[PDB]
Scaffold this active site. Structure first.
Site, PDB file in Angstrom:
ATOM      1  N   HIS A 147       0.837  -1.168   0.000  1.00 34.16           N
ATOM      2  CA  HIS A 147       0.000   0.000   0.000  1.00 34.16           C
ATOM      3  C   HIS A 147       0.865   1.208   0.000  1.00 34.16           C
ATOM      4  O   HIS A 147       0.417   2.274  -0.362  1.00 34.16           O
ATOM      5  CB  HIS A 147      -1.009  -0.012   1.125  1.00 34.16           C
ATOM      6  CG  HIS A 147      -0.406   0.094   2.490  1.00 34.16           C
ATOM      7  ND1 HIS A 147      -0.215  -0.986   3.298  1.00 34.16           N
ATOM      8  CD2 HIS A 147       0.007   1.190   3.168  1.00 34.16           C
ATOM      9  CE1 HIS A 147       0.228  -0.550   4.473  1.00 34.16           C
ATOM     10  NE2 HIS A 147       0.403   0.763   4.401  1.00 34.16           N
TER      11      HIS A 147
ATOM     12  N   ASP B  31       0.948  -7.842   2.266  1.00 33.60           N
ATOM     13  CA  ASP B  31       1.200  -6.456   1.926  1.00 33.60           C
ATOM     14  C   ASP B  31       2.651  -6.126   1.922  1.00 33.60           C
ATOM     15  O   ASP B  31       3.169  -5.497   2.842  1.00 33.60           O
ATOM     16  CB  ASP B  31       0.414  -5.671   2.923  1.00 33.60           C
ATOM     17  CG  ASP B  31       0.214  -4.228   2.529  1.00 33.60           C
ATOM     18  OD1 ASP B  31      -0.568  -3.582   3.267  1.00 33.60           O
ATOM     19  OD2 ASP B  31       0.778  -3.766   1.572  1.00 33.60           O
TER      20      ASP B  31
ATOM     21  N   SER C 131       3.842   1.826   8.290  1.00 35.47           N
ATOM     22  CA  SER C 131       3.696   0.873   7.165  1.00 35.47           C
ATOM     23  C   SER C 131       5.065   0.456   6.650  1.00 35.47           C
ATOM     24  O   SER C 131       5.864   1.300   6.332  1.00 35.47           O
ATOM     25  CB  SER C 131       3.073   1.576   5.998  1.00 35.47           C
ATOM     26  OG  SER C 131       1.746   2.009   6.285  1.00 35.47           O
TER      27      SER C 131
END
Ligand SMILES: [K+]
Length: 216
Positions: free
Chosen positions: A51, A93, A169
């Site tokens: 992402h 991810d 992230s």
């Protein structure tokens, strides 16, 4: 997400030891800047989330990486601009980001030592780990080590009870030996934070795609 275990320490000597390849990421899209984290794992290569790289809207140059950033515009290793992005083919991810040498002709994994990846043979639930990166609830481009325990290992997924916030992230998950065991992606409010667990398949993907990645 912030969890009852919110044990975070700021790393100011960001280039010492295992923290050096922990990397602050700004994806400088015209619509805004997506902040993230990542870990340098090879001479030219860093891991972060899908992402995160999606935020480039297909322009890898939008992704800037600052290994061991200490704080706002305080980037001891300078910055690097991504050139090629390879998303993990599985669900996790996870994305591989390769950088060009920067405008000083240095390589992202020469200005800092790439992380050592764990083979994860000994990783288990209840082990103490850290997730170190760049939480967005702290000041810009500050590195924080968040401490907790693995709570769940299943396939290519791990969860843990330590806190992280958007910005984290792509943060590496380290074991006690300072090997990277996973790559944080985020979490579910009041439940857990999670990472892509670098199990055999994910290790294989990484080795196939990063020629100089080092597994212990
Ligand atoms: K070079």
């Amino acid at each position: 997400v912030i969890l009852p275990n919110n044990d975070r320490h700021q790393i100011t000597d960001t280039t010492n030891g295992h923290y050096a390849p922990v990397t602050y990421i700004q994806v400088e899209a015209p619509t805004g800047t997506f902040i993230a984290s990542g870990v340098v794992v090879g001479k030219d290569t860093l891991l972060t989330n899908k992402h995160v790289v999606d935020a480039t809207h297909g322009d890898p140059h939008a992704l800037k990486a600052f290994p061991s950033a200490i704080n706002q515009d305080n980037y001891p290793n300078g910055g690097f601009t991504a050139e090629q992005i390879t998303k993990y083919s599985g669900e996790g991810d996870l994305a591989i980001v390769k950088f060009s040498p920067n405008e000083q002709n240095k390589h992202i994994g020469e200005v800092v030592k790439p992380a050592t990846m764990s083979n994860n043979a000994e990783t288990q639930t209840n082990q103490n780990i850290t997730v170190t990166g760049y939480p967005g609830d702290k000041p810009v481009a500050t590195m924080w080590e968040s401490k907790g325990k693995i709570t769940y290992l299943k396939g290519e997924a791990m969860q843990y009870d330590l806190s992280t916030t958007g910005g984290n992230s792509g943060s590496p998950v380290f074991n006690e030996k300072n090997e990277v065991i996973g790559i944080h992606w985020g979490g579910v409010p009041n439940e857990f934070n999670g990472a892509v667990f670098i199990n055999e398949n994910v290790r294989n993907f990484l080795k196939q795609n990063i020629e100089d990645i080092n597994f212990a």
